[model samples]
Target chain A: ALIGIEDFLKVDLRVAKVLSAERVEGSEKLLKLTLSLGDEERTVVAGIAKYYTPEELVGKKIVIVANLKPRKIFGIESQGMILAASDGENLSVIVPDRDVKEGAKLS
Target chain B: ALIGIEDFLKVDLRVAKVLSAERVEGSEKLLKLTLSLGDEERTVVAGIAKYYTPEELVGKKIVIVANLKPRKIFGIESQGMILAASDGENLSVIVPDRDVKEGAKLS
Candidate 1:
């Protein structure tokens, strides 16, 4: 289905740097990620625990949808969503090909 | 400016592989890219000619908003929008950290 540019723009996608990550207890698929968009920090919950480990995400730059409403999951508040490509069996986070400034807008 | 998950889902994001790219005549900022999403192919106009060349984009995997309404530019119909991170001085396309299937869903 085709979407208008307004629909796309309404979802604010931006670059975010991972400050930290950890597994959420009692959940096999959830990993709570601490992300920084320049000076602003946020917590994002992602279901990539099966594919990525907490140690591998630290200091990594990833793309995120920055405008999602906060949601509580596993007793934690998730402020945004990390963008990742999933092939059913595997997952890979979307990232800039080279280093760019943190909080760069995705256009 | 918080958005619901439904708003985010309305923008369909997918993986695409670059098949070819070329400079659009008379436009310094436009590059005409031919991208493949599994069996589907699309021509997308991107404003990255100032930062990247056609040769460098071929065979590279990138992320894109796959459902944008078609738009005509320079007499070509661009089928979708390619995702890229941009600072004032530089532009970088968002891509998967590792190889994944073409047409993979970005979540």
Candidate 2:
């Protein structure tokens, strides 16, 4: 019953590098991060400041949505999104065990 | 848009420990592995012998399915399934970077 959906193909999941991270001016919980996906890069907004710091996020390898359309938040363009599993108040992101190449497909 | 289904709840994915592994008889690409999932352990038959060997898999942290119905394959009862992604001839399995405890949920 856990069969995958064919529509899952529309979501282009890939690996990316976090180039920078900073707190958003207007949002107390939002942190904007610049992600480099080999050929191109995008800004991503996440509400993980409660669990992670901007310094800890920069230079980290992260999972990303490469095919997501642009969405503007707080006057900044967020081109992609990150995936996380939230169990009530706790949240965690998926990462690779070893250093893999940038822009590698997650699936 | 790529939206998730609540029905995806049927698939119980968890982190498991690979206890032991050996080549399966009469199969060119099958390897039987003993997996420990905290309280219960089961043998899983996988066709990854073509890319990986038995010794390389022992003690490796692997993703597992705990809610799959039992299926007998090659006279062996496979209790759960492992997930992987393939790009034509190449394939890779998802894993955690750090050494976490067994029986961890995988989103």
Candidate 3:
């Protein structure tokens, strides 16, 4: 096991809405995103461009980490991350079953 | 967001069956378990005692991490992990709505 139940909970997972998505220049499988997390919006860089297009992501809800420190990728500063399940060459982001209040914790 | 898509993939999450579960001695919120991960069975330590009982867990399906190296806790060796959602004292294990093959990747 990577962690105990407590370890998993400490990560502070939350749900966010994808306000917009776009391709990253010079990267075949990256997306530059603007996400609406309710309290604040954030920019995120995701390696899902090869399989998902910006047009497909608009208004879709997603799971993310809201407490993580920021990072810079492809000249873009990504403040948080989205959660997804992946099989070789295929990736699917986890979404809530119903519309949820923004900033609600996934737990 | 804690990481890019690749970081999440490297963690290798899969589903497992709870072959058996038992309370950890002296711990109010721990369960010691032997899990059948399809290919092999391994012990796991989880703090799920407050909400779930051993009899209720038998034959139930769960999500787990099979690639994690073993770790020791309270003299018990836990080989993998189970996934769940928690809201304060209310915690719920993440179970597939439909039956899945043992050891099937969650993706």
Candidate 4:
């Protein structure tokens, strides 16, 4: 099925800089990540701890679905979710190939 | 101002490998790019010719909105659109930080 561009634009996809990352206590796969979207800061819970360590994730520029309603997981408030691509055992975060400002919208 | 995950899930995003790229005739900013999504192939017209050459885009793994309705641009059929971020004067294509199979779904 094909969807209109309106459907794709409904989600606010933005580039964000990872400011901090830490594993959620007692969770094997969850990581708490704080991101800087230029002027705003958002904290998200990601299940990438199994593939990437907190040290590896920090300071990286990644894409996120920025306008998802807030949700709490493992008692932590998650404001957005990171975007990643997965193929069986391999997973990689999606990022701009060149430098772009944080909060840059994807189109 | 907030959307549910279901809203974002309505559009299909997939990683695609650029099999070929060339600037469209009579268009300054449009480039015709053919992509391989593992088993499927698609062609899209992107407005990055001002920033990227055809040689720079070929073989790069980039994300695309895969299920969009086909449209015509410059008399050529465009099956999808590449996802890129723009911050005022600069624009960059979003890509996987590491290698992944073509057609990998983004989430």
Clashes of 1: 0
Relative to the true structure, how large is the alpha-carbon lDDT of every model?
0.74, 0.63, 0.64, 0.74
lDDT of 1 by residue, B10-100 (tens): 7677788999886656866567788898888888877774687777888888877778756754465578888878754579877778878
For model 2, residues A1-107, the per-residue Cα lDDT tens digits are 32233423555767777899867568665677788887888887776537767887888777766676467444655677665433334445555555656777754
lDDT of 4 by residue, A53-99 (tens): 88888888988877765675446567876777865557788778877
Q: Second chain only: TM-score per model?
A: 0.85, 0.81, 0.81, 0.84
Candidate ordering by DockQ (highest first): 1, 4, 2, 3
Task: Please tell me which model should have the higher DockQ, number 2 or number 4.
Answer: 4
* Model 2: docking quality category: incorrect
DockQ of every model listed? 0.63, 0.23, 0.21, 0.59
| Ten-residue region with minimum lDDT total, candidate 2 chain B | B1-10
Best by DockQ: 1
- Model 2 over residues B1-107: C-alpha lDDT tens digits? 32232423555666777888757467676766788876788877766637666787888767666675445444456777665433333555555554666767644
**TM-scores of all candidate predictions against the true structure:** 0.87, 0.65, 0.57, 0.87
RMSD of 2: 4.8
Error of 4 at A27 (Å): 0.8
- What is the total number of backbone clashes in candidate 3? 7
- Which should have the higher lDDT, number 2 or number 3? 3
Candidate 4's TM-score: 0.87
Model 1 chain B poorest ten-residue lDDT run: B68-77
Q: What tens digits encode model 3's per-residue C-alpha lDDT throughout B1-107?
A: 44446555566776667888766457566676677777788877767747677886787766666665456555556777665544343455655433446756643
